[PDB]
Design a protein around this ligand. Structure first.
Ligand SMILES: [Mg+2]
Ligand SMILES: [Mg+2]
Ligand SMILES: [Mg+2]
Ligand SMILES: [Mg+2]
Ligand SMILES: [Mg+2]
Ligand SMILES: [Mg+2]
Ligand SMILES: [Mg+2]
Ligand SMILES: [Mg+2]
Ligand SMILES: [Mg+2]
Ligand SMILES: [Mg+2]
Ligand SMILES: [Mg+2]
Ligand SMILES: [Mg+2]
Ligand SMILES: [Mg+2]
Ligand SMILES: [Mg+2]
Ligand SMILES: [Mg+2]
Ligand SMILES: [Mg+2]
Ligand SMILES: [Mg+2]
Ligand SMILES: [Mg+2]
Ligand SMILES: [Mg+2]
Ligand SMILES: [Mg+2]
Ligand SMILES: [Mg+2]
Ligand SMILES: [Mg+2]
Ligand SMILES: [Mg+2]
Ligand SMILES: [Mg+2]
Ligand SMILES: [Mg+2]
Ligand SMILES: [Mg+2]
Ligand SMILES: [Mg+2]
Ligand SMILES: [Mg+2]
Ligand SMILES: [Mg+2]
Ligand SMILES: [Mg+2]
Lengths: 190, 172, 106, 136, 197
RNA sequence: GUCAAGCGUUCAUAGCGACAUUGCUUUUUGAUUCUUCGAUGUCGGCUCUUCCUAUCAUACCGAAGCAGAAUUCGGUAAGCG
RNA sequence: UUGCUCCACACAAUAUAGAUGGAUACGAAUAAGGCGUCCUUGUGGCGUCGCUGAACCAUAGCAGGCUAGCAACGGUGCACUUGGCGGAAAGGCCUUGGGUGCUUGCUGGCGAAUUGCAAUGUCAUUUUGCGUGGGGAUAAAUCAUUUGUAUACGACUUAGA
């Protein structure tokens, strides 16, 4: 159809500074800073009143309009991550062999290492990405908490830890053993 | 056909002994010229009435101009067309300053979106939609908002030389 | 001055040809700076030299000249048709020719 | 602490936008957008220049930075009156764009004697320029 | 109109540049093309990589040393695209192809010479925004070209040298523009402005 | 391949699948007689190379009337046997 | 039987995929940039530009002669030279100074004719040769003989004043 003008609102809270040179977005709030290259979308950012940023598509088809709300969600995730952060909580699900998840140093490269997953002799290793903080819960058993500003990094590192512990050659409606995301929320939220 | 013209064509069905002064049928025809217009006139009168060109005559053909050629108008076009497997009635809205402009846009649009040729299309009705909010189609309704303005990003400048020295820009 | 040129440069492009048959009697000329058949109508009837070099002096010159003339425009982009007194050699495809300003009108 | 988002200021297809016709019968004349027919076509009106009121593709057209206040669908007398009230031609002539159009028309119009005088005056200005450069 | 024309091949579509260069070569113009690793092909990378592997599949079955020679470097991909737009088995087309030089990066002499573009072939002028495209250095590396890192290193060096050139050139054109502005509003400069100059 | 009456302890479609119907292939056999009757050496095996994929095995996977084991259906895949 | 190479200039012969004012150097983006200016030195502020190289530089003088001044101390050609940068094929780019002319920046004086009304009207750059005068260096390879790490024959690998 080629809609003439489609436009999304982006609400900036008070402690957040957003600098958008051409389509490279830098979001600087209290937790730190984040940058996203958006030069694959062809949208137009503008600033209204230092708390509101419009993003708009002009003469855009159905898919080009679809990518605009995606752009709004990406910049909102940047703002939410540098204001509140993200916190993904995973649980260890096992039947007989207790999954042993430790965090270890190998040449300064900060690995999560998983032992005894279904009684395996194979040590699994998931590198902690930059920004992601790993800690282990107290008073909640079998809980590993991945935290950070970047929801991309926290979610992908939690997904790496889930995919590294998938069951081979067994009925997986019965062999449920694994590490699973149980909670997605924020670092500092109430 | 880039300039269609509209013609009133009045034809008669020739006077016999039982019927002097027959009924004078009139059509509005979109055609490139008067030859195509009279051809289309007999095409549609052989579909409506028991008459044909050998047993009838043309009494008038006049080109109808647009009354206000420089007023922007919303048109509803009711059209019947043949597809590859049937016949369909279709209603479209077209925004132009002229009826023949709307009909040219219709023919290009029907050939583009439906692969319908000129031989497969009957214009049932062209009517200027007199009031806003009678405009049904939302591809027309987006051009009737108040204080409408838009840019044209990515301006591509035509070059008349083979080689350019500047590494051009698409600013606008 | 630094320049002494009273001709417009051109390129011998091609014979007149169809997809598979050529005609050496007519040759297609590009003229520098000419992009339009009505811009190329200025050059009709102008006098063309193909100027080339040979090893043997024949009348006290190692430079030999083939003279011809712009006859009509060719196509939409300022190419012209030309005929020469002897047809152009066909190794001169892409070679430079000279379009003189005479016979002058303007 | 300041959000900084770039402008990227375009020329808007809008009523009252002044346009320069590049190709066609008018071809170098100023008109104004009267109404937007659709995305690729508007109704223009150039009664000072002599451009008839017509529908036109925006590809026959370059927009200018100049706007003025015109109502939508304004007829030719209204367009002429508001164009003269905004004094569009005097804004247009003062722009660097129209000075370059006038410059290349003027250099096209030069005769051979004028081109010789341009050469002589350019060498005269060049001598002073190289003196100023070599003392500065 | 130049004795040789140096095209900076960056941001150009390979076929739309190759047909233009083929016509310049056959019309008698010497063409050198630089930065062939920065050429573009329209369509996505996996698309064009499957196209190259489909090309890579065909060879002479009884002797692969007489087959289609699958040349891997981006300048050679451009050369292959430009052959086939030239009757290269005739003497005329051989002489046309002798008028062409294609290089990755910008090596000497051409790094101190003006580079042009062909706006008929520019990707930002031809492709609709949103259409995916391939960079020929990335495609060549995927199909076996060895020298992507060397060309990147030398181009970074060349750009540092070129920016130190251009800083001095702006410092000179500051003075030249100011000295031309001092000669303005004189009786010679107003005389020149009366003639469009 | 589609459709799904029905089978599958209930349950159309895990696996199947009647009555119908749409195709593909040219490794079967017919059909034809266009080429060869101033001759294109006619079966099979041995030897040796390559190619195809409609995949038997091996690699990685998805599904099961997949608890394990062993199977079955399917995907990428002809690299290698 | 004064051979070879380099440099320079005298004349010849071969030619030429095609000289005729100048290939005139940022990089990046293109839903963005360039330039100028200012500060807090940034993904900054302000101003300005594009809408093509239709530009810019260059361009007057017997294919450009001879000569006289004025103004300026600029521009430019050729060699000599100082210093530096350049290895992607650098083989170029930027300099320092002295000569050496020229200058149309301005104003003068003389000459051009008959190439007879056009006839590229010859002014470019590679190969070479040969002539002259100014430097420079003073070998190998192959056959034959020999080896067997080699080998149908060639080839290969060894040896020999
Ligand atoms: Mg698995
Ligand atoms: Mg099992
Ligand atoms: Mg008809
Ligand atoms: Mg359609
Ligand atoms: Mg832009
Ligand atoms: Mg022809
Ligand atoms: Mg042509
Ligand atoms: Mg000829
Ligand atoms: Mg030829
Ligand atoms: Mg000057
Ligand atoms: Mg040539
Ligand atoms: Mg071909
Ligand atoms: Mg350049
Ligand atoms: Mg590689
Ligand atoms: Mg290889
Ligand atoms: Mg099927
Ligand atoms: Mg069931
Ligand atoms: Mg026989
Ligand atoms: Mg045989
Ligand atoms: Mg398969
Ligand atoms: Mg399988
Ligand atoms: Mg195995
Ligand atoms: Mg195989
Ligand atoms: Mg195998
Ligand atoms: Mg700016
Ligand atoms: Mg700035
Ligand atoms: Mg090197
Ligand atoms: Mg001079
Ligand atoms: Mg031996
Ligand atoms: Mg032997």
């Amino acid at each position: 159809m080629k809609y003439i003008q489609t436009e999304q609102q982006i609400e900036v809270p008070e402690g957040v500074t957003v600098s958008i040179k051409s389509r490279i977005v830098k979001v600087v709030g209290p937790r730190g800073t984040l940058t996203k290259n958006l030069k694959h979308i062809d949208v137009t950012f503008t600033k209204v009143n230092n708390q509101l940023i419009k993003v708009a598509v002009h003469n855009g088809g159905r898919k080009h309009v679809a990518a605009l709300r995606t752009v709004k969600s990406l910049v909102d995730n940047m703002i939410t991550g540098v204001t509140k952060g993200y916190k993904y909580k995973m649980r260890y699900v096992y039947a007989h062999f207790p999954i042993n998840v430790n965090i270890v140093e190998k040449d300064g490269a900060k690995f999560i290492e998983v032992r005894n997953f279904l009684g395996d002799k194979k040590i699994r290793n998931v590198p902690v990405r930059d920004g992601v903080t790993i800690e282990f819960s107290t008073n909640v058993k079998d809980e590993i908490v991945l935290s950070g500003n970047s929801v991309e990094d926290v979610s992908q590192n939690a997904a790496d830890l889930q995919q590294i512990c998938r069951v081979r050659n067994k009925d997986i409606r019965k062999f449920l053993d694994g590490i699973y995301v149980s909670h997605k929320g924020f670092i500092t939220e109430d | 056909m880039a300039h269609f013209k509209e013609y009133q064509v009045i034809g008669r069905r020739l006077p016999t002994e039982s019927v002097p002064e027959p009924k004078l049928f009139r059509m509005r025809i979109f055609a490139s010229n008067e030859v195509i217009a009279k051809s289309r006139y007999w095409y549609f009168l052989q579909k409506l009435h028991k008459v044909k060109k050998a047993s009838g005559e043309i009494v008038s053909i006049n080109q109808i101009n647009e009354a206000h050629p420089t007023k922007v108008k919303n048109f509803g076009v009711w059209v019947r067309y043949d597809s590859r497997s049937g016949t369909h009635n279709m209603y479209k809205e077209i925004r132009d300053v002229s009826r023949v402009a709307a009909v040219e846009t219709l023919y290009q649009d029907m050939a583009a979106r439906h692969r319908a040729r000129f031989r497969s299309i009957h214009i049932l009705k062209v009517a200027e939609i007199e009031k806003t909010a009678d405009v049904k189609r939302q591809y027309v309704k987006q051009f009737l908002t108040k204080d409408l303005k838009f840019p044209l990003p990515h301006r591509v400048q035509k070059s008349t030389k083979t080689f350019s020295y500047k590494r051009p820009s698409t600013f606008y | 001055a630094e320049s002494h040129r009273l001709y417009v440069k051109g390129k011998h492009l091609s014979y007149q040809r169809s997809k598979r048959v050529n005609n050496p009697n007519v040759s297609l000329i590009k003229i520098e700076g000419v992009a339009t058949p009505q811009d190329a109508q200025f050059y009709l009837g102008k006098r063309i030299a193909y100027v080339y070099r040979a090893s043997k002096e024949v009348r006290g010159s190692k430079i030999r000249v083939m003279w011809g003339k712009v006859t009509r425009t060719h196509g939409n982009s300022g190419v012209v048709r030309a005929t020469f007194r002897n047809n152009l050699p066909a190794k001169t495809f892409g070679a430079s020719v000279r379009i003189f300003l005479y016979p002058s009108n303007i | 602490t300041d959000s900084i988002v770039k402008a990227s200021n375009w020329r808007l297809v809008e009523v009252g936008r002044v346009v320069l016709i590049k190709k066609g019968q008018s071809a170098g004349k100023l008109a104004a957008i009267v109404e937007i027919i659709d995305q690729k076509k508007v109704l223009i009106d150039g009664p000072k220049a002599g451009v008839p009121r017509q529908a036109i593709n925006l590809g026959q057209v370059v927009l200018t930075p100049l706007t003025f206040a015109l109502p939508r669908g304004a007829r030719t007398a209204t367009v002429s009156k508001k164009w003269a009230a905004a004094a569009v031609c005097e804004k247009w002539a003062a722009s660097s764009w129209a000075k370059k159009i006038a410059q290349r028309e003027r250099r096209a119009a030069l005769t051979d004697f004028e081109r010789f005088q341009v050469m002589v005056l350019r060498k005269q200005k060049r001598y002073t320029v190289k003196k100023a450069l070599a003392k500065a | 109109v130049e004795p040789v024309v140096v095209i900076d091949g960056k941001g150009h579509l390979v076929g739309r540049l190759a047909s233009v260069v083929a016509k310049q070569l056959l019309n008698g113009q010497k063409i050198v093309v630089v930065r062939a690793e920065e050429l573009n092909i329209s369509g996505e990378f996996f698309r064009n990589k499957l196209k190259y592997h489909d090309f890579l599949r065909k060879a002479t079955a009884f002797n692969k040393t007489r087959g289609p020679f699958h040349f891997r470097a981006p300048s050679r991909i451009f050369y292959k695209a430009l052959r086939g737009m030239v009757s290269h088995k005739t003497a005329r087309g051989k002489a046309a192809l002798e008028r062409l030089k294609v290089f990755e990066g910008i090596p000497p002499p051409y790094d101190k010479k003006k580079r042009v573009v062909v706006p008929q072939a520019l990707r930002v002028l031809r492709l609709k925004p949103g259409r995916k495209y391939t960079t020929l250095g990335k495609l060549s590396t995927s199909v076996g070209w060895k020298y992507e890192d060397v060309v990147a290193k030398l181009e970074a060096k060349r750009k540092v040298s070129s920016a130190e050139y251009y800083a001095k050139k702006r410092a000179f054109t500051k003075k030249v523009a100011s000295a031309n502005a001092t000669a303005a509003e004189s009786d010679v400069a107003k005389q020149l402005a009366a003639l469009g100059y």
